[PDB]
From Swiss-Prot, chain A:
Present with 16800 molecules/cell in log phase SD medium. Component of the lid subcomplex of the 26S proteasome, a multiprotein complex involved in the ATP-dependent degradation of ubiquitinated proteins. In the complex, RPN6 is required for proteasome assembly. It comes from the Eukaryota. N-acetylated by NAT1. The gene is RPN6. Belongs to the proteasome subunit S9 family. Component of the lid subcomplex of the 19S proteasome regulatory particle complex (also named PA700 complex). The 26S proteasome consists of a 20S proteasome core and two 19S regulatory subunits. This is 26S proteasome regulatory subunit RPN6. The chain holds residues 381 to 434 of 434 of the full protein.
Swiss-Prot record, chain B:
N-acetylated by NAT1. It comes from the Eukaryota. It comes from Saccharomyces cerevisiae (strain ATCC 204508 / S288c). The lineage of its organism: Eukaryota, Fungi, Dikarya, Ascomycota, Saccharomycotina. The gene is RPN8. Belongs to the peptidase M67A family. Coiled coil: none annotated. Present with 19800 molecules/cell in log phase SD medium. Disulfide bonds: none annotated. This is 26S proteasome regulatory subunit RPN8. Acts as a regulatory subunit of the 26S proteasome which is involved in the ATP-dependent degradation of ubiquitinated proteins.
UniProtKB/Swiss-Prot annotation, chain F:
This is 26S proteasome regulatory subunit RPN3. GO terms for biological process: proteasome-mediated ubiquitin-dependent protein catabolic process; regulation of protein catabolic process; ubiquitin-dependent protein catabolic process. Acts as a regulatory subunit of the 26S proteasome which is involved in the ATP-dependent degradation of ubiquitinated proteins. Signal peptide: none annotated. Residues 463-475 have a biased composition (Basic and acidic residues). It comes from Saccharomyces cerevisiae (strain ATCC 204508 / S288c). Present with 16700 molecules/cell in log phase SD medium. GO terms for molecular function: enzyme regulator activity. The gene is RPN3. Residues 253-433 form the PCI domain. Keywords: Acetylation, Phosphoprotein, Proteasome.
Curated annotation (Swiss-Prot), chain G:
Interacts with UBR1. Belongs to the proteasome subunit S1 family. Disulfide bonds: none annotated. The chain holds residues 4 to 74 of 945 of the full protein. Transmembrane segments: none annotated. It comes from Saccharomyces cerevisiae (strain ATCC 204508 / S288c). The lineage of its organism: Eukaryota, Fungi, Dikarya, Ascomycota, Saccharomycotina. Present with 4750 molecules/cell in log phase SD medium. This is 26S proteasome regulatory subunit RPN2. N-acetylated by NAT1. Acts as a regulatory subunit of the 26S proteasome which is involved in the ATP-dependent degradation of ubiquitinated proteins. The gene is RPN2.
Amino acid sequence: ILDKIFYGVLDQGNGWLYVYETPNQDATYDSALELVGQLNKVVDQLFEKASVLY
Amino acid sequence: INISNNLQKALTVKTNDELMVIYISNLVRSIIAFDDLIENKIQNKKIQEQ
Amino acid sequence: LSESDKKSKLISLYLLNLLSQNNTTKFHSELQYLDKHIKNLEDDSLLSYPIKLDRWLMEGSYQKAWDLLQSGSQNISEFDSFTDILKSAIRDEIAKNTELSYDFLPLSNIKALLFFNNEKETEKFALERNWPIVNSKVYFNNQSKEKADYEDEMMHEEDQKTNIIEKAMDYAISIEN
Amino acid sequence: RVPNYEVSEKAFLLTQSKVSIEQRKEAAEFVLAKIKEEEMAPYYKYLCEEYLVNNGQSDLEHDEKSDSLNEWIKFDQELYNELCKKNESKIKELNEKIQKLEEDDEGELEQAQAWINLGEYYAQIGDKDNAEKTLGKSLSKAISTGAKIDVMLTIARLGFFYNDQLYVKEKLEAVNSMIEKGGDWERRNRYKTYYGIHCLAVRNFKEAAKLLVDSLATFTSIELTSYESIATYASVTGLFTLERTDLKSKVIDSPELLSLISTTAALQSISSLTISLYASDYASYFPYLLETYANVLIPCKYLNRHADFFVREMRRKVYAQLLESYKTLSLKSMASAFGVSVAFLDNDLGKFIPNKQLNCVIDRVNGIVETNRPDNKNAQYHLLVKQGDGLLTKLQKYGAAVRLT
Amino acid sequence: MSTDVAAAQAQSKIDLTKKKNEEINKKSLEEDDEFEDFPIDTWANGETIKSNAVTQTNIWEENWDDVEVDDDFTNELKAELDRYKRENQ
Amino acid sequence: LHHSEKKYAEEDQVQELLKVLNEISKTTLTLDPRYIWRSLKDLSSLRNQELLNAETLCFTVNVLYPDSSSFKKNLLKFITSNHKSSVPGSAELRNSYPASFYSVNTEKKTIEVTAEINCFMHLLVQLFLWDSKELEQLVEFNRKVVIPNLLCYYNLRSLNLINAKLWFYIYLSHETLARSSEEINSDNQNIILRSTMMKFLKIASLKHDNETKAMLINLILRDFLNNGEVDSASDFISKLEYPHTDVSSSLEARYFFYLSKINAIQLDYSTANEYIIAAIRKAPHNSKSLGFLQQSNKLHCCIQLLMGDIPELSFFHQSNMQKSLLPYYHLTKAVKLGDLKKFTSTITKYKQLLLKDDTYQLCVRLRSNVIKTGIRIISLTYKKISLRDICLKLNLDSEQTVEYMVSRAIRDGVIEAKINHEDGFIETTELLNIYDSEDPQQVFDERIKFANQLHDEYLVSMRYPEDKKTQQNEK
Amino acid sequence: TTAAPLLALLRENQDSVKTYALESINNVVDQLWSEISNELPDIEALYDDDTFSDREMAALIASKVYYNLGE
């Protein structure tokens, strides 16, 4: 499960193995993290411009 | 809706930079404005002479 | 003659009066006014009764409140005129709580919780508080439904709810204005 | 230069009293020996400045403490008289020789080099103030870029000698500016290890982890602590920062660690922990935890600050990987895995859980532990929206400030 | 001094002559800077500003400590005790 | 010598005055007189504080004095007399003007325009009392003379805005005198003060003088926080129409501060929290604002504890305010741990320091919130947990007691759990997967609109000083 | 100080103190304007009745208050 080579989770509350083979991670949502990431960096730099006004 | 949120916010970044830029343009134009007043003193008298 | 023996006595009773409305808004606002006068000059020593009572319901121990109130019927004068209202107030407070806590309670357990000893009184309160005890089991969930519906029922209502279509319309007009 | 990091390292052991009695005592004998030879008498007195009436103090130079387990720190006035004799002598002689080299004229080369020779003596006897001055004159006069890198580093090493982490901090910004201007690789290796050890001393182990892997592959030994020690620093940073997969691939694709096997107690305790962690053995994970504490953190100057921080974080990671592999565990099964009793486990889980970096809950009545940590779309949502509040907030304030002015 | 992140509020504002008096007024409105009353009030100098590593001096990054309890004592008592119980089973 | 120092100072004052007087003679403006006035106010105060006492006397003598000379003189005799600088030609002059209050013109009495002059002599004296820093009688004399004078005539837009800055000093001297001493007769004088404040606002209401309006509102709010008339003040705040687009940022910070204090006492901590963070952002980082910031940041830590939100450890460390915020720090560690035992110690140890900040009234309410936080710890650590277990950890009294603590707490939804009576446990119900639900949608909608509003602020500000520069002769 | 006495007096149903109270409320009107605005419909109640000759006074409170409210 640590390799992630078939995914799944192991339940010792009854003794089953659930085998989940469903897709992971939304690609679209994930690339939105790097885009926000870059906007959060830029605004510190815009604030360097605004030191001119002060 | 979440992509739309990031985008509205991206457009806000861009605009707050355009807000600071024009504000610098005004800070610059201030110097020119000061200098102009002392200068216009000299010009008034000459044009009346002619 | 502006801070008197009499002042201390009358402020105590006033605070019970604000409390028997079951408003914490006025109580603390009035409490603030007192910091500046008597509350540390002649101290709390009779002004302690509404302030300890207020405490025990803010944390949520109703046993403490109940006990304080029971010994406050030892104090026979005019503090007791508010005791009987305020015991009723602990019940009413508890009855909003129990909707969230439980969805099944036995008939003995509803009685225990509201500090009663008479089964006929428990069932009597239930009529008035609008609970349907049918077969000796309360149905808190029935009651929730009616309560939610009424707040929808009065108009406000397109924008109260909000529509999928309507969000996009709002955003659209802002950009093209 | 070279003996200096040995002394500093040994001395550290006397600073604490949480180390073994027999290990501190052998180390104390060593230090006295180099007090005589290398003139380390000023740093002996310095340890007493850092206590004030704290354990490890028994000094006859000033105040003494009888609650200390240290008793080998006890000064003499034989130590003090021997000092003034040696100090006075050495300095008069060596400066005189250096002075004639300045007199003989060649500005760029001869004078600049003469100015370096003072800074080695002052480093040796452990005075930061006099070293800095004399080596400052060297940098001022044009010399090769490598030399400039050497000398800035030399100054930054005196900050680890006294353990003033800030002293290291300031000076190495100057290395990072001159590293590309010099553009030399010989000393590039050294830089990565110095700035590595800086990161090690503070709480930034992510930066350390990337710098210290490089240190293993290629090593320069000048002004840097012994290579067995450098392996021990790498394994610490890897376990703390990286997770199963990255960590695993890293210690199989490092030949250097593997060819060296165990060779000192600290290295052994760290390496043991490693194997157990990615291999999924939890029986033996736990003895190794106890072992690392004793022989790795306490002896090191730069990890003794982190002694407690280290155990805390490491219990979180082990648990994380376990929780990943299971939907549910029973508390008793989870306890037997560790080799700790039933009650023992409940405490440990309950210090991590309200802080919410373990992301599981415990049905006590069912005795199961449930894991409700998201890895779906819900997880991504939590990350993103928190950052997006932060963008709003940053724009709000900087916005308001510019409109008003 | 500073408040919040030091650079985020330090760059934001400066004194202009127009604003200068007006700040002086807000301080006086409060009555005192409130940092020259606190030493008087302790009756020497503090004792619990040294209670924690980050509290002592702000030069280290956060370590999120507030209890300061070494964990090595409790873990050794745990290890040894599970083992004896099992051994004598 | 001494005279020479008053004359060099005086000529600075006269240019700034001369410059305002022309702008207002053309047609009244607000902001352009305002910018000039704000610079001058600072300089005058620094020159009067460091140098002389009769440097104020000089100006008053020089220009027509309606009574100001006599009023200045009374002050100067008590703190060490002055009779110098009374010489003629420093009193037969009426300074230099092109003809607006020139020496020949004012004697000739074709004009007499004491208006603005009256306004500047009042600023000089009002600052001087505050520079002296003496209370008693001196305060009282200052209030009497200046207030009825300004109210006999109807003020112009220019004069009204000046008089807002006079009013401040009046409140501040009077308030410190009252907090220094307990005199029974002062209570009765406070009623007169209250009356004057509200009338000043009503006069200004008619003339639409935006700065005057805002400045007065802050004082009245302060006056309520000092007297305990929180009770009145709930009324006051729902009927304000405070300016934001045409006022100084010092006023806007003060305003935001007051609201959080009043809101917090009425057990609304949600709105309290938003209002204080805004006051902090308006208020700078300098040591000029230092006592303001200390109080604001005390209230913010306490607010987040009243929520059960709790401030981070980051905050106290990155501030260099560690010793001052020490009672709050200990509080924050205490509430978190859920220790009733610790908490009893924290508010007792630090009692006095807290009450001076008047957050003590708020703090007592946490002895309860300490319990609610504590049982929240328990339900996170353990999903399903016996009634008995909880009673053991926090020293609670019965299964029945803890049942009841949790019953109140989950109406407020802190714990976010529900009690099963029939099995005997307390079960939290959170398991997430709320991405599926319509809840995130609601959140994303709010975020966009905070952004659309920021576009509006940007648009109105950006283009407005450009438009001025074009009109202006500069190219 | 407070307008809270004046509210008490209108709420009292002895006529003399109601007459009195119209006079006293208009004395302090532009000071205690917020407080008495909340319980201004009381003041109006007395104006509608035909037992009073102090109708003008009662009207008069409201006009001064209502300005200050903002309408």
